[PDB]
């Protein structure tokens, strides 16, 4: 558990439907959502690989489960029943515990993705933005759509805005 989902970010966004992880920007020009396509695509690829590994790894051979025995062979009806019950028990236990653990793994994976996105934007903004809680930031300067697009893209260009941020921060 990485503490992002249901942690310092309490709830999800119903209005961001084209991705799993995204940004919400609020400017003088306007407010809007923007899903992070790269992280969402990587997560989707990982989840698809997980599901395929679970599904496409059961390579079975042609078998006919079921034998007929008369009343003079009861030991073999019992042995066949023993084999069948043993296999059923093994598969039930394994499948149930397997899904139980991968569900936790998937939830932790999504939490890690959200936490990493937050850490990336935090390390990018440095001291030009204030952590106002709810797992997000308020800028110390005026960011137009170019600034927010640069933050989302991955090239914030901190020293362009450092001086005005210092002027507005040391108030």
């Amino acid at each position, epitope marked *: 558990l990485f503490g992002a989902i249901a942690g310092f970010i309490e709830g999800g966004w119903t*209005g*961001m*439907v*084209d*991705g*799993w992880y*995204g940004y919400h920007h609020q400017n003088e*020009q*306007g407010s*809007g*959502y*923007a*899903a992070d*396509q*790269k992280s*969402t*695509q990587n997560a*989707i690829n990982g*989840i698809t690989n997980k599901v395929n590994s679970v599904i496409e790894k059961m390579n079975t051979q042609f078998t006919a489960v079921g034998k007929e025995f008369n009343k003079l062979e009861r030991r073999m009806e019992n042995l066949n029943k023993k084999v069948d019950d043993g296999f059923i028990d093994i598969w039930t236990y394994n499948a149930e515990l397997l899904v139980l653990l991968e569900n936790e793994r998937t939830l932790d994976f999504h939490d890690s993705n959200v936490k990493n996105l937050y850490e990336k934007v935090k390390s990018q903004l440095k001291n030009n933005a204030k952590e106002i809680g709810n797992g997000c930031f308020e800028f110390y300067h005026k960011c*137009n*759509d*170019e600034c927010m*697009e640069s933050v989302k*893209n991955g090239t914030y260009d901190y020293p362009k805005y450092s001086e005005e941020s210092k002027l507005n921060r040391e108030k």
Partner: antibody, heavy 126, light 108 residues
Framework: EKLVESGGGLVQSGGSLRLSCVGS????????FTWVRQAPGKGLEWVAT????????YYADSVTGRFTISKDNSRNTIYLQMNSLRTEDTAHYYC????????????????????WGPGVEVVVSS | TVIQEPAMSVSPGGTVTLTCAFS?????????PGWYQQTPGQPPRQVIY???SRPTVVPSRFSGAISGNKATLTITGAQAEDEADYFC??????????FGGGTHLTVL
């Protein structure tokens, strides 16, 4: 199911325009739309896109901060407001609809644009 | 960036193939190649979506494949109404679908 575009023409440099696309035959509430321009002598370039609900909006790096794409579900219209136009914005503009795909509860853009419009010619001469 | 062939020609009734490739990579089924046909004065039409899938309205002469890490559109028996510009749109992890320059198929 056709998209008809309008609102383009000759505009001075530094001006503004509001291109409009009207879709007949479907509801825009469950479709993601896009605006793509073809420059004279160049290939098609993605300009903007809007998601199914309308919350998510993406713009190209060249038109960021100057273009705004919005949706009007009541009038079945898609608006591209272009501001601070330059000489590089002269193009044939097309409005297109993303093919419906759903990956794990999300609305993707994998399959590309399925419906297109005839387009409107926009020229920006200083 | 997506690279196509500035112009190609074919005689009527002859099969032709149009290619689409990345500048610095390989094209796979995960890129979901798409082929669009643009005739002057009319809206573009998605001839092929995904690698090989085809809309019902589209004629059956059109077929799509991935060969030699390149997306390919094959027209078997090109008629006179297939004289248009063909664009290849690939998928690159985002909503910014890169488009090719365009191939002008001139049916002689």
């Amino acid at each position: 199911e056709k998209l008809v575009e309008s609102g383009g023409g000759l505009v001075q440099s530094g001006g503004s325009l509001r291109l409009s696309c009207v879709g007949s035959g479907f509801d825009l509430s469950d479709n993601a739309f896009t605006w793509v321009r073809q420059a004279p002598g160049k290939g098609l370039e993605w300009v903007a896109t809007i998601s199914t609900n309308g919350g998510s909006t993406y713009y190209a790096d060249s038109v960021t901060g100057r273009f705004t794409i919005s949706k009007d579900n009541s009038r079945n219209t898609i608006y591209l407001q272009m501001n601070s136009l330059r000489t590089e914005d002269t193009a044939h503009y097309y409005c297109a609809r993303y093919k419906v795909c759903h990956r794990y509860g999300l609305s993707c853009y994998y399959y590309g644009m399925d419906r297109w419009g005839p387009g409107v010619e926009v020229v920006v001469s200083s | 960036t997506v690279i196509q062939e500035p112009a190609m020609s074919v005689s009527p009734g002859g099969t032709v193939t149009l290619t689409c490739a990345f500048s610095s990579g390989s094209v796979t089924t995960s890129n979901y190649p798409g082929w669009y046909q643009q005739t002057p004065g009319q809206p573009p039409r998605q001839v092929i979506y995904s690698t090989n899938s085809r809309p019902t309205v589209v004629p059956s002469r059109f077929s799509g494949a991935i060969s030699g890490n390149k997306a390919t559109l094959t027209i078997t028996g090109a008629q006179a109404e297939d004289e248009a510009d063909y664009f290849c749109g690939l998928y690159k992890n985002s909503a910014n679908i890169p488009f090719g320059g365009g191939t002008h198929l001139t049916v002689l």
